[PDB]
Design a protein around this motif. Structure first.
Motif, PDB file in Angstrom:
ATOM      1  N   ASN A 251       0.816  -1.226   0.000  1.00  0.00           N
ATOM      2  CA  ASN A 251       0.000   0.000   0.000  1.00  0.00           C
ATOM      3  C   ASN A 251       0.836   1.257   0.000  1.00  0.00           C
ATOM      4  N   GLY A 252       2.031   1.216  -0.620  1.00  0.00           N
ATOM      5  CA  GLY A 252       2.924   2.366  -0.650  1.00  0.00           C
ATOM      6  C   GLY A 252       4.010   2.371   0.355  1.00  0.00           C
ATOM      7  N   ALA A 253       3.979   1.463   1.330  1.00  0.00           N
ATOM      8  CA  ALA A 253       4.997   1.410   2.379  1.00  0.00           C
ATOM      9  C   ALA A 253       6.303   0.767   1.929  1.00  0.00           C
ATOM     10  N   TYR A 254       6.371   0.201   0.713  1.00  0.00           N
ATOM     11  CA  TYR A 254       7.595  -0.405   0.243  1.00  0.00           C
ATOM     12  C   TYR A 254       7.625  -0.327  -1.291  1.00  0.00           C
ATOM     13  N   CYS A 255       8.434   0.568  -1.853  1.00  0.00           N
ATOM     14  CA  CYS A 255       8.427   0.839  -3.267  1.00  0.00           C
ATOM     15  C   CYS A 255       9.806   0.611  -3.854  1.00  0.00           C
ATOM     16  N   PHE A 256       9.873  -0.013  -5.040  1.00  0.00           N
ATOM     17  CA  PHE A 256      11.170  -0.313  -5.637  1.00  0.00           C
ATOM     18  C   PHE A 256      11.064  -0.326  -7.160  1.00  0.00           C
ATOM     19  N   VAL A 257      12.215  -0.060  -7.780  1.00  0.00           N
ATOM     20  CA  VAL A 257      12.359   0.004  -9.230  1.00  0.00           C
ATOM     21  C   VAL A 257      13.576  -0.867  -9.540  1.00  0.00           C
ATOM     22  N   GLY A 258      13.347  -2.003 -10.170  1.00  0.00           N
ATOM     23  CA  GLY A 258      14.440  -2.956 -10.349  1.00  0.00           C
ATOM     24  C   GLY A 258      14.856  -3.460  -8.989  1.00  0.00           C
ATOM     25  N   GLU A 259      16.139  -3.410  -8.694  1.00  0.00           N
ATOM     26  CA  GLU A 259      16.639  -3.821  -7.394  1.00  0.00           C
ATOM     27  C   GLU A 259      16.716  -2.660  -6.408  1.00  0.00           C
ATOM     28  N   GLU A 260      16.356  -1.450  -6.809  1.00  0.00           N
ATOM     29  CA  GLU A 260      16.521  -0.266  -6.027  1.00  0.00           C
ATOM     30  C   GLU A 260      15.284   0.077  -5.216  1.00  0.00           C
ATOM     31  N   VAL A 261      15.393   0.021  -3.897  1.00  0.00           N
ATOM     32  CA  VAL A 261      14.313   0.537  -3.037  1.00  0.00           C
ATOM     33  C   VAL A 261      14.314   2.062  -3.115  1.00  0.00           C
ATOM     34  N   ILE A 262      13.190   2.632  -3.458  1.00  0.00           N
ATOM     35  CA  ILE A 262      13.064   4.095  -3.564  1.00  0.00           C
ATOM     36  C   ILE A 262      12.360   4.725  -2.404  1.00  0.00           C
ATOM     37  N   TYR A 263      11.622   3.947  -1.606  1.00  0.00           N
ATOM     38  CA  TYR A 263      10.908   4.447  -0.453  1.00  0.00           C
ATOM     39  C   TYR A 263      10.474   3.258   0.388  1.00  0.00           C
TER      40      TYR A 263
ATOM     41  N   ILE B 152       7.154   6.839  -7.171  1.00  0.00           N
ATOM     42  CA  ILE B 152       7.532   6.333  -8.479  1.00  0.00           C
ATOM     43  C   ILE B 152       7.734   7.485  -9.471  1.00  0.00           C
ATOM     44  N   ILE B 153       6.791   8.427  -9.519  1.00  0.00           N
ATOM     45  CA  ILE B 153       6.918   9.453 -10.547  1.00  0.00           C
ATOM     46  C   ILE B 153       8.112  10.375 -10.218  1.00  0.00           C
ATOM     47  N   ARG B 154       8.404  10.594  -8.939  1.00  0.00           N
ATOM     48  CA  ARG B 154       9.624  11.349  -8.523  1.00  0.00           C
ATOM     49  C   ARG B 154      10.823  10.689  -9.140  1.00  0.00           C
ATOM     50  N   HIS B 155      10.920   9.344  -9.079  1.00  0.00           N
ATOM     51  CA  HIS B 155      12.084   8.646  -9.600  1.00  0.00           C
ATOM     52  C   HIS B 155      12.244   8.786 -11.111  1.00  0.00           C
ATOM     53  N   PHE B 156      11.128   8.781 -11.839  1.00  0.00           N
ATOM     54  CA  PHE B 156      11.138   8.814 -13.280  1.00  0.00           C
ATOM     55  C   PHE B 156      10.996  10.226 -13.865  1.00  0.00           C
ATOM     56  N   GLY B 157      10.809  11.253 -13.101  1.00  0.00           N
ATOM     57  CA  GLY B 157      10.605  12.600 -13.655  1.00  0.00           C
ATOM     58  C   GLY B 157       9.246  12.768 -14.339  1.00  0.00           C
ATOM     59  N   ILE B 158       8.293  11.944 -14.002  1.00  0.00           N
ATOM     60  CA  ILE B 158       6.940  12.006 -14.556  1.00  0.00           C
ATOM     61  C   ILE B 158       6.099  12.933 -13.709  1.00  0.00           C
ATOM     62  N   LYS B 159       5.228  13.727 -14.344  1.00  0.00           N
ATOM     63  CA  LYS B 159       4.360  14.589 -13.609  1.00  0.00           C
ATOM     64  C   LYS B 159       3.063  13.887 -13.226  1.00  0.00           C
ATOM     65  N   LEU B 160       2.472  14.341 -12.111  1.00  0.00           N
ATOM     66  CA  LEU B 160       1.198  13.728 -11.679  1.00  0.00           C
ATOM     67  C   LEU B 160       0.150  13.819 -12.784  1.00  0.00           C
TER      68      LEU B 160
END
Ligand SMILES: [Mg+2]
Length: 261
Positions: free
Chosen positions: A69-81, A195-203
């Motif tokens: 529910n948002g408490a554990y976010c990752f992109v590939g092997e990288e935890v982002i939050y 996720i969008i912070r990591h990718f430079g995507i706007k809301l």
């Protein structure tokens, strides 16, 4: 235009009736991937029990994960939050559940446990949802863990009874027999933001898809929120668009409607 898609899993990608992903969903995500959409999972499940996405995973179609529910976010092997629940609130939930005689799952970063599993756990998590058996630990041991998410098998009435002792946590449901509890502010909406912070995507370039109460915040927060056709009325009301039922090509139809594909 849309750059990032956020999909709930249960009742959104994976049918509760068949326990499979519709064929047209896989085709739609293949087509979106080739158009350069980023495709993200946004689930209440911890990674440890995401056992139902191999078709997408083996096709290399998922760009990142929002779990718990948002408490554990990752992109590939990288935890982002990630986050953890205040220990007082972990202990209070464990005490409440033990006193009331209901089970509770406790999820750590790299372990998952269940305390006093009973008919509700069997019926729902294993025999239905096809989750692998979660190891049992005592409530005492659980109450001392660094916990990212707890999943008590409590009714709405019991939720209101224990709420004063989890005063800062978020509580959401994706299935009626239990709820997911995470730390302050950790909902799928937070996951989108990370996720969008990591990718430079706007809301304003986001689209979300869901069927359940724990999707409402991301249905409202994404630029475009899509509710599955079988969702309850409050979930549909939080969305901008209601698609067909999951097993009547709901995802593909929605994606086509918006011109994603
Ligand atoms: Mg769902």
């Amino acid at each position: 235009m849309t750059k990032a898609l956020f999909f709930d899993i249960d009742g959104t990608l994976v049918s509760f009736e068949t326990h499979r992903i519709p064929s047209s969903t896989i085709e739609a995500l293949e087509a979106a991937h080739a158009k350069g959409l980023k495709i993200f999972i946004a689930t209440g499940r911890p990674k440890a029990i995401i056992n139902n996405l191999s078709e997408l995973q083996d096709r290399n179609l998922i760009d990142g994960y929002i779990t718990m529910n948002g408490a554990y976010c990752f992109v590939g092997e990288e935890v982002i939050y990630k986050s953890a629940i205040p220990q007082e609130e972990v202990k209070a939930m464990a005490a409440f559940c033990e006193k009331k005689g209901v089970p509770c799952i406790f999820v750590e970063e790299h372990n998952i446990s269940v305390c006093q599993p009973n008919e509700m756990v069997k019926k729902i998590f294993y025999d239905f949802l096809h989750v692998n058996v979660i190891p049992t630990v005592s409530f005492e041991e659980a109450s001392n863990k660094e916990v990212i998410q707890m999943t008590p098998f409590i009714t709405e009435e019991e939720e209101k009874e224990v709420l004063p002792s989890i005063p800062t946590c978020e509580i959401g449901r994706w299935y009626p027999a239990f709820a997911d509890v995470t730390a302050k502010g950790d909902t799928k909406q937070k996951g989108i933001d990370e996720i969008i912070r990591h990718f430079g995507i706007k809301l304003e370039e986001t689209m979300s898809f869901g069927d359940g109460g724990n999707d409402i915040s991301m249905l409202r927060h994404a630029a475009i929120g899509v509710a599955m056709g079988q969702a309850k009325e409050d979930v549909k009301a939080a969305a901008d668009y209601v698609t067909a039922p999951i097993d009547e090509d709901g995802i593909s139809k929605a994606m086509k409607h918006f011109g994603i594909i």
